[PDB]
Design a binder for this molecule. Structure first.
Ligand SMILES: [Mg+2]
Ligand SMILES: [Mg+2]
Ligand SMILES: [Mg+2]
Ligand SMILES: [Mg+2]
Ligand SMILES: [Mg+2]
Ligand SMILES: [Mg+2]
Ligand SMILES: [Mg+2]
Ligand SMILES: [Mg+2]
Ligand SMILES: [Mg+2]
Ligand SMILES: [Mg+2]
Ligand SMILES: [Mg+2]
Ligand SMILES: [Mg+2]
Ligand SMILES: [Mg+2]
Ligand SMILES: [Mg+2]
Ligand SMILES: [Mg+2]
Ligand SMILES: [Mg+2]
Ligand SMILES: [Mg+2]
Ligand SMILES: [Mg+2]
Ligand SMILES: [Mg+2]
Ligand SMILES: [Mg+2]
Ligand SMILES: [Mg+2]
Ligand SMILES: [Mg+2]
Ligand SMILES: [Mg+2]
Ligand SMILES: [Mg+2]
Ligand SMILES: [Mg+2]
Ligand SMILES: [Mg+2]
Ligand SMILES: [Mg+2]
Ligand SMILES: [Mg+2]
Ligand SMILES: [Mg+2]
Ligand SMILES: [Mg+2]
Ligand SMILES: [Mg+2]
Ligand SMILES: [Mg+2]
Ligand SMILES: [Mg+2]
Ligand SMILES: [Mg+2]
Ligand SMILES: [Mg+2]
Ligand SMILES: [Mg+2]
Ligand SMILES: [Mg+2]
Ligand SMILES: [Mg+2]
Ligand SMILES: [Mg+2]
Ligand SMILES: [Mg+2]
Ligand SMILES: [Mg+2]
Ligand SMILES: [Mg+2]
Ligand SMILES: [Mg+2]
Ligand SMILES: [Mg+2]
Ligand SMILES: [Mg+2]
Ligand SMILES: [Mg+2]
Ligand SMILES: [Mg+2]
Ligand SMILES: [Mg+2]
Ligand SMILES: [Mg+2]
Ligand SMILES: [Mg+2]
Ligand SMILES: [Mg+2]
Ligand SMILES: [Mg+2]
Ligand SMILES: [Mg+2]
Ligand SMILES: [Mg+2]
Ligand SMILES: [Mg+2]
Ligand SMILES: [Mg+2]
Ligand SMILES: [Mg+2]
Ligand SMILES: [Mg+2]
Ligand SMILES: [Mg+2]
Ligand SMILES: [Mg+2]
Ligand SMILES: [Mg+2]
Ligand SMILES: [Mg+2]
Ligand SMILES: [Mg+2]
Ligand SMILES: [Mg+2]
Ligand SMILES: [Mg+2]
Ligand SMILES: [Mg+2]
Ligand SMILES: [Mg+2]
Ligand SMILES: [Mg+2]
Ligand SMILES: [Mg+2]
Lengths: 146, 100, 63, 202
RNA sequence: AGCAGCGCCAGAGAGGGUGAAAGCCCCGUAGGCGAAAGGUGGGGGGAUAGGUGAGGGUACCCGAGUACCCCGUGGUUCGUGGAGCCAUGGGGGAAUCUGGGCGGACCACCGCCUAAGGCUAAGUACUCCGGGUGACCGAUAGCGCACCAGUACCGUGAGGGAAAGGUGAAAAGAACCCCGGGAGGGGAGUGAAAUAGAGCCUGAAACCGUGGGCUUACAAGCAGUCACGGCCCCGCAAGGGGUUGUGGCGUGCCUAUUGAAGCAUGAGCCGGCGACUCACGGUCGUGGGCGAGCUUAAGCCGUUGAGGCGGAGGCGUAGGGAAACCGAG
RNA sequence: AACCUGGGGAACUGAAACAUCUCAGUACCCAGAGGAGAGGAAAGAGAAAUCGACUCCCUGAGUAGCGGCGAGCGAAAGGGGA
């Protein structure tokens, strides 16, 4: 195995198109044909109707802002106890983020789908439904306080 | 400075081209051009002369300077690279194995 | 260099977990007066967009 | 593949290994492509009609002169003028996923084993940094000089030895990389290195 | 210096030059050594300036037109907004730790910090300058300038701003004779080569010319094409090449347009220059790695065309609601 | 040469008109600094009974917000580094 033929994998074929040609893409460009095909066109997504945009629709997003803005406040990361079955020991915020499916989301909340492996599972909050799931087979220890 | 090289006024073989083989005293070294003079390339200047003084001035087949690289210096064993060796005080140039 | 999200749209349109684009119905803030209970009850909810829906998503970006 | 030839005073003791079985031809390429783009210097530049020197004075009236309408001599239609989409300097590097780099290293070293050309050694009798020594050691080792050789070794003196040989590529152990591996015919490496190659993966 | 034969060196097979294509000829390269003098120099050392305690009482001090408040503005993500904070042009105007400021109007609580004096290296920015390197240019390119260029020239002036590189290995640069006032040539001579002979390598095209072949003065034309024929040429012939007499046919090119041979646009002709790029971020598709995971950014270490470390962070694993919140709903 | 700091400071342009807004504290003018310049040892951060001068890079983040809530503009704390 040498530099002859370790070549690309019969399909990464870099091949841009060239619009000065005479046969292919020609007087005009790749496309073109016309006028307002030159340096730009208004947007054209969001923008140009040419007219009153289709932001005829209307802010509901009550609580858009306020000068100093975002209010710090404890956010909870939903993690199912179906991805809990994935192991055995004592599952804790430290662990679920330490590898997997938490990610610094200040607060652990176990909940929902799947079947609960009998074991201790500390968290900042549980599902009315998931409290059951596992409470009916093992320890539910709740968050911190102070 | 730096312009210095192979030899100087002394004795030399020519591993050149036209005069490949020939040996001779280098009657000339001009470093600005990098060219020595032995008795090798000595071609003919049909020329009368450049300056009017001294009426006739020679078709002289004078000695055409050489690329200072086509000549090599030489001793008991002829034609050697030069080494530089230091005495007890100075710098004398030993040869491929001999000296001088 | 990094397109900026279009705040105007953010402020008025959600992009649903499947991929739809939801908006509040127009027509329910002062044309209002006498309009059937039905009329303005119907205006109460969100709808789903279409071709501009794609236009829409293009803005909401790191969003 | 598996059983790879080792050398030592006591003779060829063919020790085994766990290198891949399947060689992704393409993937090697991806890595060699990458080693080679990251090694580029951006370096080629040109001046737009902006960087070029000339004044901006609109060259003539543009009317009733009856020459073709014109701005400044900077404009690219002008000879001497600025270049159009000529190259500014730039970074050709990209971050090839580590896992891919790893695969490739394996697979490269892998490829060369299944062929046969991989030889781990040890008996580096080529004492000091003197080509002639390594030249000798190479002889009584089956390194005729007829095939290109990537000597990988901790021993900087062994390194010193091989260096000035046209058919050889000395290279510290961590220097192991796939362009070089493929770039060459034989792979020959100190066991202390094949240990470290086994570290990056083994 | 190629080819051949037999050798050698290599910590040096980077590169350059020498009459072409050299590890060993030359200059270098690897490796290693060097400063009287000037500059640099805490990196190492030394010294000096300075600096360092615990309890109690006292209520002396702790930066003033300052805080603070209001009017007018600036900065900040903040466009007068619920509008704080920092800064300050106008007006009023304190206290010294039971002092003051801040934590987004305000108040209470809790907590943070000590304004109205000053100084402080490093990490950072740049590139006139020196060097190194290039999937950078190669004389219409690359700097405007490879050349005696910020010149010539142009403008009162600010200012604008060119063109122009290459004999040969070596000048061996063509003695000498001949025609000519010279220029320039013809011989002679040098050179491997002189249609390499001096703005001299190569020397394309337009353009001008000399010689030859076919052709043309009753003929109608986008100049060609199809056919037959005559002439000339290459081949033994079958064939081909050149030319064009007659016959058939036949409305330039681009552009722009419903529509152009068009009495619409552009173009004297030739050569060279000339227009869909890149960066970031999107979105599809596609080649591949890994997979409920996947991936690193600066940076650090390595190297000096070697990579590795680096999980901060990002995307994904749950949605719905304006939200509180609830959650496979 | 450029870099830097302070004083002053546009318009084309964008908004498919335009005036707020944008361009942009950019272009430039002026004073000064220097091998850099600035900044710099909390009357700080902002929600943790936490951090612990300043500057620079990565990130946070096109997030928080700002906005004829148009066009657009666009932080910080924290975390990783020097
Ligand atoms: Mg336009
Ligand atoms: Mg309208
Ligand atoms: Mg020779
Ligand atoms: Mg999906
Ligand atoms: Mg209702
Ligand atoms: Mg995001
Ligand atoms: Mg300009
Ligand atoms: Mg100029
Ligand atoms: Mg004209
Ligand atoms: Mg140019
Ligand atoms: Mg031998
Ligand atoms: Mg050579
Ligand atoms: Mg000395
Ligand atoms: Mg020294
Ligand atoms: Mg120092
Ligand atoms: Mg002491
Ligand atoms: Mg003392
Ligand atoms: Mg006391
Ligand atoms: Mg006041
Ligand atoms: Mg206040
Ligand atoms: Mg303001
Ligand atoms: Mg304000
Ligand atoms: Mg307003
Ligand atoms: Mg307050
Ligand atoms: Mg004031
Ligand atoms: Mg508060
Ligand atoms: Mg209180
Ligand atoms: Mg420089
Ligand atoms: Mg330089
Ligand atoms: Mg360039
Ligand atoms: Mg030029
Ligand atoms: Mg020229
Ligand atoms: Mg220059
Ligand atoms: Mg004049
Ligand atoms: Mg002469
Ligand atoms: Mg003559
Ligand atoms: Mg005579
Ligand atoms: Mg006369
Ligand atoms: Mg003359
Ligand atoms: Mg010739
Ligand atoms: Mg010729
Ligand atoms: Mg002449
Ligand atoms: Mg001439
Ligand atoms: Mg010619
Ligand atoms: Mg003929
Ligand atoms: Mg006739
Ligand atoms: Mg003929
Ligand atoms: Mg006509
Ligand atoms: Mg016409
Ligand atoms: Mg017209
Ligand atoms: Mg033309
Ligand atoms: Mg005309
Ligand atoms: Mg892209
Ligand atoms: Mg600047
Ligand atoms: Mg406008
Ligand atoms: Mg417009
Ligand atoms: Mg426009
Ligand atoms: Mg300023
Ligand atoms: Mg100074
Ligand atoms: Mg510095
Ligand atoms: Mg400083
Ligand atoms: Mg200062
Ligand atoms: Mg202090
Ligand atoms: Mg301060
Ligand atoms: Mg502490
Ligand atoms: Mg509006
Ligand atoms: Mg702004
Ligand atoms: Mg650093
Ligand atoms: Mg740095």
């Amino acid at each position: 195995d040498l530099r002859p033929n370790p070549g690309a994998n019969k399909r990464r074929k870099r091949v841009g198109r060239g619009p000065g040609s005479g046969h292919g893409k020609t007087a005009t460009r790749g496309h073109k044909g016309q006028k307002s095909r030159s340096g730009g066109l208004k947007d054209p997504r969001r923008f140009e109707g040419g007219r009153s945009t289709t932001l005829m629709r209307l802010p509901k997003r009550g609580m858009q802002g306020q000068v100093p803005g975002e209010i710090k406040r404890p956010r909870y990361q939903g993690v199912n106890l179906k991805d809990l079955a994935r192991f055995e020991g004592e599952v804790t915020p430290e662990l679920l983020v330490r590898a997997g499916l938490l990610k610094k989301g200040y607060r652990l909340k176990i909940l929902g789908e799947g079947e609960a492996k009998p074991l201790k599972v500390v968290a900042h909050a549980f599902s009315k439904s998931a409290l059951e799931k596992l409470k009916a087979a093992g320890g539910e220890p709740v968050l911190l306080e102070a | 400075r730096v312009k210095m090289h192979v030899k100087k006024g002394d004795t030399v073989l020519v591993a050149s081209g036209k005069y490949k083989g020939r040996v001779g005293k280098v009657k000339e070294v001009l470093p600005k051009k990098y060219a020595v003079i032995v008795e090798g390339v000595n071609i003919v200047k049909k020329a009368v002369r450049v300056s009017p003084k001294y009426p006739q001035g020679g078709f002289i087949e004078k000695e055409a300077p050489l690329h200072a690289s086509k000549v090599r210096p030489i001793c008991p064993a002829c034609g050697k690279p030069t080494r530089v060796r230091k005495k007890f005080l100075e710098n004398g140039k030993k040869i491929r194995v001999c000296a001088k | 260099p990094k397109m900026k999200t279009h705040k105007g749209a953010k402020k008025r349109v959600k992009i649903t977990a499947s991929g739809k684009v939801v908006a509040m119905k127009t027509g329910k803030r002062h044309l209002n007066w006498q309009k059937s209970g039905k009329e303005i009850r119907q205006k109460g909810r969100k709808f789903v967009l279409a071709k501009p829906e794609a236009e829409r998503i293009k803005l909401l970006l790191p969003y | 593949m598996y059983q790879i030839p080792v050398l030592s005073p006591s003779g060829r003791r063919e020790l085994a290994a766990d290198l891949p079985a399947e060689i992704n031809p393409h993937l090697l390429w991806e890595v060699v492509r990458w080693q080679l783009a990251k090694r580029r210097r951006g370096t080629a530049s040109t001046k737009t009609r902006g960087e070029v020197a000339y004044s901006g004075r609109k060259i003539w009236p543009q009317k009733h002169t009856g020459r073709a309408r014109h701005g400044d001599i900077g404009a690219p239609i002008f000879v001497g003028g600025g270049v159009v989409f000529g190259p500014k300097p730039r970074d050709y590097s990209y971050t090839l996923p580590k896992k891919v780099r790893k695969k490739g290293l394996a697979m490269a070293v892998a490829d060369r084993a299944r062929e046969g050309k991989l030889l781990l050694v040890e008996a580096f009798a080529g004492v000091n940094g003197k080509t002639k020594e390594f030249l000798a050691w190479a002889k009584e080792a089956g390194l005729d000089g007829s095939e290109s050789v990537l000597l990988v070794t901790g021993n900087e003196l062994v390194r010193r030895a091989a260096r000035n040989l046209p058919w050889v590529v000395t290279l510290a152990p961590e220097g192991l990389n796939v362009y070089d591996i493929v770039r060459t015919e034989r792979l020959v490496m100190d066991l202390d290195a094949w240990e470290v190659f086994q570290n990056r993966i083994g």
